[PDB]
């Protein structure tokens, strides 16, 4: 009569072939296996590096299991790839083999807001068996584990306020109340959630959490800021150019280990090849990467960057790297320009335990300091402003140059390399 | 519930008779029809019925719906759920197999109500407990009532029920007493050595007619062969031992064998799968094959045991007093140049049936070298496996012309 069988092996047997390769899609190089074993293990951060293992685990305190873990990452990274990749990982019975017997792929690509249905995904992500023992161990939370791939890239309008809550996994509903339901904890109660997404997506799934662990990416390794750089550029003949003007320059890369300085490089590279430029380029020209990432950030603001240099300038010649909300008022730079340039992601808050502000890298500071001499119109903004008379510390490029070696007025060496 | 004959007067008999007696009908055609389409929908899901009839609270029509459910399979989730099963699952005497999905409830006297009933039933045959939070102090509530004189409980699929070694003697006080239980399935749980120790205390008792056992993944080591070993050597009535998914390394498998080899021995399918084995153990398991002229199905896949293991192996299965059937050799690490042995056995072996070859590269040559000598009138006409094993063009062109040309054959069974 009933079939005695393990079906949570059944289960993990079809997840390691189905997730064999990056793709397991035809038209790769004659659909050969892309060998999984090329991934770069991706490095975490907890919103404090973190590992693979331990992610929906209880911190130091209170003793609370992690239902909801929410991965964040620049455009181009590949998030897919790490969720595919640990399916295969735990499939393979290495991830999380003590704390899942299910993990449930959900292709947020493939999944339909509109469609009213019962929660078939844990059907439809089995293997071909058209009668899974879906009042099983698949039914069972706790050990139940869903990878939301792709929120941001959910196709059709969602909505984060939503009045039936979706519960009886048994009961048809709408795809977005649905997936809503599993993201608010209301359908199958304890089970645990993954989602990976792009920072975009992050305004409207908070407000289904309320008290997820934010995950976030060390940095990239070497190979990931390679593939970083090859999917960024849709166009593979750019990827590769905008990857050699890199890739003569060690010192670029090395602080492009950094997810968001990646994006911001790429992002750079991307305006100097829609500009039409012959490339005859050699980046760090950190200077040159930074103006062409500026002009792409800021041409689609451009009016109030007077603000944000003068906070540069007196970054460098005080030696002062976080910066108070005083010393935004008084250089300008206040509310509405600091939302504006925190959006046009430039700057830091420098969420993790402090109360400060702070640009995204030193260089950064210091390329802006440089502007600050180079600056052009004419506003009276600088002067009534409530922190006058400013000390808009000189302007006097003699004096930066005079105090080139001197380390007690920050060293001024990338400044002045940033004027040339 | 308002469908009922045991009321009084005062204006309860306001309702009607000959209608009532039509609905009654009714309601016990749409419990028939419900009740044998047992598949998934989002109509009575089983229990759903057995609300209703547990509302008619009326044996003579509870006990006849009840019949219409020779396989009852539900989902508790809390106490109303075990009093409406309880209830229904005593008034049938129609139901060969039952399974108990419980939910966020176990390890409580919380359920007792109902495993009291399962014991009194006497068509109940097959119990399936397994996949759900039936920790020990859940599984000696049940094996208080597996002891019960009217049990009747021949199959307890006690499956991945979060059991550890505190079951065992719950457990082995079963077996000991209820002579009914012949299929135990005790495997996807933690019954490690110690468990096994105390499991066999029942296991070598009289009186325990268990005939079939499953140990499959239960965190054991070589340590508890020492124990199995001598159930297999006393047991009167064990002939199914699976045991693979375990650490039972060759070491272990030596000791099972040093009592399996025994002529006496009523061994009849011995499942050393997932074991760990080398062809270190392949001669012990060789000298079983050999003697035990009972052991009929062999299953050894994942057992790196490789060229060496078969020939090894097949100095057993040539043996003329060997009376294996069925040898399984999926992923055993294996490479072409045991073909010339494994085609010995396909020849040569008059005992066996079934050689479920699999996911090893054994070479597509060999495979072809396979079909040639099989049409020398081989008896291996079941499953030749060779599954999840890929081969060229003039391979799978044999393979297909084998199946024309020996016709006999069951199947080769190619991957593509």
């Known amino acids: 009569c009933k079939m005695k069988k393990d079906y949570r092996k059944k289960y993990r047997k079809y997840v390691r072939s189905r997730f064999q390769c990056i793709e397991d899609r035809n038209a790769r190089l004659g659909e050969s296996v892309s060998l999984n074993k090329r991934y770069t293990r991706l490095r975490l951060i907890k919103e404090s590096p973190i590992k693979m293992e ?14 909801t873990v929410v991965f964040q990452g620049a455009a181009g990274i590949g998030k897919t790839i790490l969720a595919r990749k640990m399916m295969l990982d735990w499939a393979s019975g290495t991830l999380y083999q003590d704390r899942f017997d299910y993990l449930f792929y959900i ?314 | 519930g308002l469908v009922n004959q045991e009321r009084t007067s005062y204006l309860e008999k306001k309702l009607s008779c000959k209608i009532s007696q039509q609905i009654r009908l009714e309601l016990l055609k749409w419990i028939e029809v419900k009740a044998k389409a047992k598949k998934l929908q989002i109509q009575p899901s089983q229990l759903e019925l057995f609300y209703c009839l547990y509302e008619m609270q009326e044996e003579d029509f509870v006990q006849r719906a009840m019949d219409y459910f020779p396989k009852i399979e539900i989902n508790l989730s809390t106490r109303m759920d075990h009093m409406v099963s309880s209830f ?74 979060g059991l550890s070694h505190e079951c065992c003697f719950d457990i082995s006080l079963v077996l000991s007493s209820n002579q009914k239980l012949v299929e135990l399935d005790l495997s996807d749980n933690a019954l490690g050595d110690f468990g096994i120790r105390l499991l066999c205390v029942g296991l070598k008792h009289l009186l325990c007619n268990l005939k079939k056992l499953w140990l499959v993944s239960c965190c054991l080591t070589s340590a508890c062969c020492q124990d199995l070993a001598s159930v297999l050597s006393t047991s009167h009535s064990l002939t199914r031992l699976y045991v693979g998914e375990n650490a039972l390394g060759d070491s272990g498998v030596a000791i099972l064998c040093e009592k399996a080899k025994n002529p006496q021995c009523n061994l009849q399918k011995l499942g050393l799968v997932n074991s760990g084995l080398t062809s270190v153990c392949c001669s012990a398991l060789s000298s079983v094959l050999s003697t035990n002229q009972n052991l009929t199905h062999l299953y050894l896949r994942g057992n790196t045991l490789g060229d060496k293991g078969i020939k090894l192996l097949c100095e057993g299965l040539l043996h003329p007093d060997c009376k294996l059937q069925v040898l399984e050799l999926d992923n055993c690490n294996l490479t072409s140049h045991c073909c010339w042995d494994l085609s010995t056995l396909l020849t040569s072996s008059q005992s066996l049936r079934k050689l479920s070859l699999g996911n090893n590269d054994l070479g597509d040559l060999g495979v072809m070298m396979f079909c040639e000598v099989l049409k020398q009138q081989s008896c291996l006409l079941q499953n030749l496996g060779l599954s999840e094993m890929y081969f060229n063009y003039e391979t799978k062109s044999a393979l297909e012309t084998l199946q024309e040309e020996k016709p006999e054959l069951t199947v080769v069974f190619e991957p593509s």
């Open chain 1, 54 to 67: 331990l992610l929906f685990d209880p911190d130091d305190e209170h003793s609370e299991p992690v239902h």
């Open chain 1, 107 to 420: 292709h947020c690509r493939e999944v339909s807001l509109v469609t009213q249905r019962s929660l078939g995904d844990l059907i439809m992500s089995c293997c071909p068996d058209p009668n899974p023992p879906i009042h099983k161990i698949v039914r069972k939370p706790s050990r139940i584990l869903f990878l939301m791939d792709g929120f941001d890239e959910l196709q059709g309008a969602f909505d984060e306020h939503i009045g039936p809550l979706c519960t009886d996994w048994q009961k048809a509903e709408r795809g977005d109340i649905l997936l809503s339901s599993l993201i608010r904890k209301k359908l199958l109660p304890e089970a645990s959630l993954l989602i990976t997404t792009r920072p975009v997506a992050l305004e409207k799934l908070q407000h289904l959490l309320d008290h997820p662990r934010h995950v976030e990416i060390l940095g990239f390794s070497e190979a990931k800021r390679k593939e970083y750089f090859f999917k960024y550029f849709s166009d593979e003949a750019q990827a590769r150019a905008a990857f050699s003007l890199i890739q003569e320059n060690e010192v670029l890369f090395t602080m492009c280990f950094i997810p968001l300085v990646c994006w911001i490089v790429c992002t750079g590279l991307k305006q100097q090849m829609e500009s039409g430029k012959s490339l005859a380029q050699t980046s760090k020209t950190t200077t040159a990467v930074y103006v062409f990432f500026l002009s792409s950030l800021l041409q689609p603001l451009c009016a109030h960057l007077w603000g944000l240099c003068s906070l540069a300038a007196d970054g460098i010649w005080n030696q002062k790297i976080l910066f108070e909300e005083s010393d935004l008022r008084n250089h300008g730079l206040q509310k509405a320009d600091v939302s504006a340039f925190l959006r046009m992601n430039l700057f830091q808050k420098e969420v993790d335990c402090e109360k400060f502000y702070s640009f995204i890298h030193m260089t950064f500071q210091e390329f802006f300091a440089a502007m600050y001499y180079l600056l052009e119109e004419e506003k009276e903004g600088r002067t009534n402003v409530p922190g006058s008379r400013l000390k808009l510390p000189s302007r006097d490029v003699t004096v930066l140059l005079e105090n080139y070696g001197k380390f007690e007025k920050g060293y001024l060496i990338f400044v002045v390399r940033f004027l040339f």
């Open chain 2, 88 to 161: 229904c699952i005593e008034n049938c005497h129609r139901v060969e197999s039952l399974s108990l999905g419980f939910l966020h409830n176990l390890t409580s006297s919380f359920c007792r109500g109902l495993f009291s009933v399962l014991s009194t039933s006497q068509s109940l045959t097959e119990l399936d407990l397994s996949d759900n939070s039936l920790g020990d102090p859940g599984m000696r509530v049940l094996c208080e009532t597996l002891q019960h004189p009217g049990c009747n409980i021949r199959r307890l699929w006690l499956g991945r029920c």
